[PDB]
Protein: H-NS/stpA-binding protein 2
Amino acid sequence: MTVQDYLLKFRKISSLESLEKLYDHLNYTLTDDQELINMYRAADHRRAELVSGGRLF
Structure:
């Protein structure tokens, strides 16, 4: 419990809508490269994981 990475919160996200929200939200908060570099990895992982995971009907 010695880590406070926002990536952990993104992983819990299931809806893609939250993606654009978490970005504009975190991007407006600090507006630093930190959230920019994190949102990029999380967004890519979530998108790649969903597409390279299992299609739902």
The chain has three helices and no strands. Residues 1-57 form a domain with the Monooxygenase fold (CATH 1.20.1280.40).
